[PDB]
Symmetry: D5
Amino acid sequence: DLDDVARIRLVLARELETINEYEAYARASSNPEVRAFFQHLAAEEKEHVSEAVHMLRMLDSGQN
Amino acid sequence: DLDDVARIRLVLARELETINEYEAYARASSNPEVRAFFQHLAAEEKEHVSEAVHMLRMLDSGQNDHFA
Amino acid sequence: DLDDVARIRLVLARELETINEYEAYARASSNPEVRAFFQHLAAEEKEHVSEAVHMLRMLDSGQN
Amino acid sequence: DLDDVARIRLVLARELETINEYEAYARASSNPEVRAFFQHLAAEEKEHVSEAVHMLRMLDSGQN
Amino acid sequence: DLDDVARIRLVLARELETINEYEAYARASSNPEVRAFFQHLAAEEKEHVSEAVHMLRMLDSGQNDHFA
Amino acid sequence: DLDDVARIRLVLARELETINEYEAYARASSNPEVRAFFQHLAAEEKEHVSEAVHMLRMLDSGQN
Amino acid sequence: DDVARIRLVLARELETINEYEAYARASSNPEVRAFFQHLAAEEKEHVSEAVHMLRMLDSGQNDHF
Amino acid sequence: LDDVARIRLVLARELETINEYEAYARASSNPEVRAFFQHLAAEEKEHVSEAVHMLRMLDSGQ
Amino acid sequence: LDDVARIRLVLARELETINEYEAYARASSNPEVRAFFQHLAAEEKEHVSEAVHMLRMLDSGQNDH
Amino acid sequence: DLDDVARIRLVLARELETINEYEAYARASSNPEVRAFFQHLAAEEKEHVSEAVHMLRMLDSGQN
Ligand SMILES: [Ca+2]
Ligand SMILES: [Ca+2]
Ligand SMILES: [Ca+2]
Ligand SMILES: [Ca+2]
Ligand SMILES: [Ca+2]
Ligand SMILES: [Ca+2]
Ligand SMILES: [Ca+2]
Ligand SMILES: [Ca+2]
Ligand SMILES: [Ca+2]
Ligand SMILES: [Fe+3]
Ligand SMILES: [Fe+3]
Ligand SMILES: [Fe+3]
Ligand SMILES: [Fe+3]
Ligand SMILES: [Fe+3]
Ligand SMILES: [Fe+3]
Ligand SMILES: [Fe+3]
Ligand SMILES: [Fe+3]
Ligand SMILES: [Fe+3]
Ligand SMILES: [Fe+3]
Ligand SMILES: [Fe+3]
Ligand SMILES: [Fe+3]
Ligand SMILES: [Fe+3]
Ligand SMILES: [Fe+3]
Ligand SMILES: [Fe+3]
Ligand SMILES: [Fe+3]
């Protein structure tokens, strides 16, 4: 029994964990192309975080 | 192998899932006072999410740059 | 199937795990401000544990 | 890395989930004496939760 | 999906799990009274396991036929 | 960290869930050969349960 | 190693796309629906990038690719 | 989920069970506990032979 | 884990994979997607044959049945 | 609510994890015979990944 706000919260949480993974893998790699690739993915995931927080702000009354 | 920003992100993810749970339990509950209790816990968790987002934007430059 | 008492027990169990996580993160944190923020979150979660225990005792005359 | 209070919190969370399971199994049971056995287990588990809560209040200054 | 015997098997499996956790926590804990508390809990779940085995043998005749 | 009695307890819990699976599959099947195969397996698993409880009673004085 | 990490990220992105599209389908607000569709399109771009990386670092994968 | 799938599931669980029994036998300090785990491992390998037989008799593609 | 335990884990995973492929073939609506999943199931059955051969070769106790 | 494309994506994700497992086992194993076995398994799984990716591109407009 999820609603729209709950699904957005779930996507935001998943995105935050994904950023953790991207940064971990960038640190764990020593090939600079792989490192750069993971850093790029992490930055774009951070854009997704911003977008989901902004959606959450529009929809959720208790947050905004 | 985990730093402060990763820990903040994990706190935030857990808090968001907690809010989902609290709101679902408030909707599901029949006792008005149980409902009010879950509503209170959900509102407090939203306050903590606001604080955690502020911390994350303080510690994660690129996150802040995306206008988090 | 869940009733109110079951949902309160689940909330209490999740709160207890949450406190564990916050205290572990505070112990692991290198930044004193981050440590203080986690300690903050843990103290307020403990307040909610007390409330959830009271509520459980109110609904389950077996105490729990 | 866990400390004593953290172990107590984990045992408390587990016990609460166990109570949920015992009460659900009592409900779902068609044999009334299997029902009775599950209710007896739930009551003994509630007694454990009482003790763990008290221990946690004694060792945790925050009085969760 | 489950009958009474299956729920009893699940309860016994969970109890065995739980004793493992209690005894490990006793071994690991630093305060002698915390460690005694966990030992007492282990002893009480062991009594529960005895009761559950008796219930299981009573309701599962083939299990009883193999003994314990 | 586990000791010998904990490993025996884990194998016992796993066997009990295995019997649950076997009996459920014997019910779910309509082909008599497959039914009987699953019932034979559940019987042999019940033997393993007896043996493990016997080892546990030997090695755990609080269980015996 | 690095190739295993790329494979794990690709699998996670594929599951994420599935989530975004399921949430789009279940959304009641059409603006939320559109948001999940937008996320799905961006994650699909991430999948293309990861497949490219994998094809570059795994000559055995580029063999059939 | 059909009969052949239930048999594949039983066979997979049995193989993982054998692995567990042998790992526990290797990890165990009491030799009688070690031998008990090796006994369970051998019996479970018998179960694997039986499940493979059943799977081949029901799955012509296998 | 030793080599025989790794063979066993691979074989268990392959059997579960065949289950997933067959379930998805049953659930899918596009005929070519159904045929794709059926084809993957057939080739995984071949891998299972190889795994059991390898298991018997390396486990005398299993080979004795 | 899985559709055809979602099932394709899950099969691809599983195949990729499987390739990871095969290469890890090939590394960790002692016998060169089992090494070669796991290598051959990895290679055919990579063929499957290629097939899955083509199916995905074809069902999913948004993929490239
Ligand atoms: Ca994500
Ligand atoms: Ca919580
Ligand atoms: Ca318990
Ligand atoms: Ca228990
Ligand atoms: Ca078993
Ligand atoms: Ca992702
Ligand atoms: Ca088994
Ligand atoms: Ca496989
Ligand atoms: Ca696979
Ligand atoms: Fe994303
Ligand atoms: Fe991504
Ligand atoms: Fe964007
Ligand atoms: Fe919190
Ligand atoms: Fe606050
Ligand atoms: Fe709370
Ligand atoms: Fe207990
Ligand atoms: Fe119990
Ligand atoms: Fe006690
Ligand atoms: Fe047997
Ligand atoms: Fe067994
Ligand atoms: Fe025997
Ligand atoms: Fe078995
Ligand atoms: Fe295959
Ligand atoms: Fe495959
Ligand atoms: Fe394979």
